[PDB]
């Protein structure tokens, strides 16, 4: 009875993480896999304290006691109501500077830095100042509120797992309108079980046709 | 000209957003404030005047509050594509087929909540799930199911979320359903609330659903 504990940001369950876990489980039938939802920031102390062994997060927070590998970047999209003018560009995409005067829903509401830190930074990076920002608890809430007419939201491509009536996802074309997925571990040599997790990630990414790959070590 | 609406978050996967949007369009001078909260919290929020209408998954009887059952949603079983239960997707399964499986209950908010009704419908027929685990919200349950951890009972509107190798299987028990309520203060007579009711009626009519009662 050996155990690996994995922390993850909840919204990563809309992407490739469940496939990664499922394959990892098939490869390690004797392994107990414990899954703990937590924000990226929370994963730092969880790793240092040994409450988790690896953390899937959406940014890199530097702490000397942990280390990181960039798995991949997801494209950001603009979630809009179907009646919004922006939806006419659904098949071609828009840019950050098209969004400045819109009501933007940011998320999550957990301690900073979090997903939304980078979102605001990419605006600032090009001298853009969004004039109307609201923070909500998590992405699926933001999406439901967009469908209800509450504004727009910048969301990872993976959230297209959620399809709602009159909700549309519009591509964001700025090359830096992307959001990273990181794996974080203690700053020491990975265990055999963590190395196996890396290989499982590599395998799922190979199925998706991603190239790096990814990268790794 | 401000209306405050409380809602259970998972209701945003069904008809509620299109109801709110149609309602909003018809009231350009109305400020709509939307508050995510469990059904238990809506009851106190209504009595305390913090919201004007609450959309919930259950009825908490209180003399200060009046409820209207909008409709019942079918419950479905979320399973991994490879799960034996997914071989009965066309015909459906019954609650008594689920009893030996690891069932993911949710949410972890204060009780009573959606998981209360789910466990009650088993209890109502002398069925006791042998393996249960409570998770925070529906998307955690769904992701864990897709990851191979267990199964979950969910409202049919959950099918708005489609994950790789996640399948939804109909339940056949007539009472394997989950209600959607609107709750308002007992002496509520606001024109904006009347309009909200009528907007629900319009959307339901378009969907071919039964027309909700009083009002
Ligand atoms: Cl989120």
Curated annotation (Swiss-Prot), chain B:
Swiss-Prot/TrEMBL GO biological process terms: catabolic process
GO MF annotation list: DNA binding; DNA-binding transcription factor activity
Binding site for cis,cis-muconate: 10, 39, 114
Keywords: Activator, Aromatic hydrocarbons catabolism, DNA-binding, Transcription, Transcription regulation
Residues binding benzoate 2, per UniProt: 15, 55, 71, 113, 204
GO cellular component: protein-DNA complex
Top-level taxon: Bacteria
Residues where benzoate 1 binds: 10
Function in brief: Positive regulator of the ben and cat genes for benzoate degradation. BenM is necessary for ben gene expression but not for expression of the cat genes, which can be regulated by CatM. Binds to the inducers cis,cis-muconate and benzoate.
Family: Belongs to the LysR transcriptional regulatory family.
Assembly with partners or alone: Homotetramer; dimer of dimers. The dimers can also associate to form linear, higher oligomers (in vitro).
Domain notes for this protein: Contains a secondary binding site for benzoate in addition to a primary effector binding site that can accommodate either cis,cis-muconate or benzoate. The existence of this secondary binding site may explain the synergistic effects of cis,cis-muconate and benzoate.
UniProt name for this protein: HTH-type transcriptional regulator BenM
Organism, as annotated: Acinetobacter baylyi (strain ATCC 33305 / BD413 / ADP1)
Taxonomic lineage from the root: Bacteria, Pseudomonadati, Pseudomonadota, Gammaproteobacteria, Moraxellales
Gene this chain is encoded by: benM
């Amino acid at each position: 009875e050996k155990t690996i504990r994995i922390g993850f940001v909840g919204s990563l369950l809309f992407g490739l993480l469940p496939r990664i876990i499922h394959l990892y489980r098939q490869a390690h039938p004797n392994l107990r896999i414990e899954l703990y939802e937590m924000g990226t920031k929370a994963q730092t102390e969880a790793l240092k304290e040994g409450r988790i062994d690896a953390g899937f997060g959406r940014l890199k927070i530097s702490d000397p006691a942990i280390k990181h590998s960039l798995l991949r970047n997801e494209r950001l999209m603009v979630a809009v109501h179907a009646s919004h003018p922006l939806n006419q560009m659904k098949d071609k995409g828009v840019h950050l500077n098209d969004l400045i005067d819109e009501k933007i829903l940011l998320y999550p509401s957990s301690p900073k830095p979090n997903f939304s830190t980078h979102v605001m930074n990419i605006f600032s990076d090009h001298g853009l100042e969004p004039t109307k920002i609201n923070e909500v608890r998590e992405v699926q809430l933001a999406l439901g509120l967009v469908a209800a007419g509450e504004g727009i939201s910048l969301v990872p491509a993976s959230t297209q797992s959620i399809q709602l009536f009159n909700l549309s996802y519009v591509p964001l074309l700025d090359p830096d309108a992307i959001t990273p997925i990181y794996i974080a571990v203690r700053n020491m040599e990975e265990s055999t079980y963590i190395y196996s997790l890396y290989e499982t990630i590599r395998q799922i990414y190979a199925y998706e046709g991603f190239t790096e790959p990814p990268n790794w070590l």
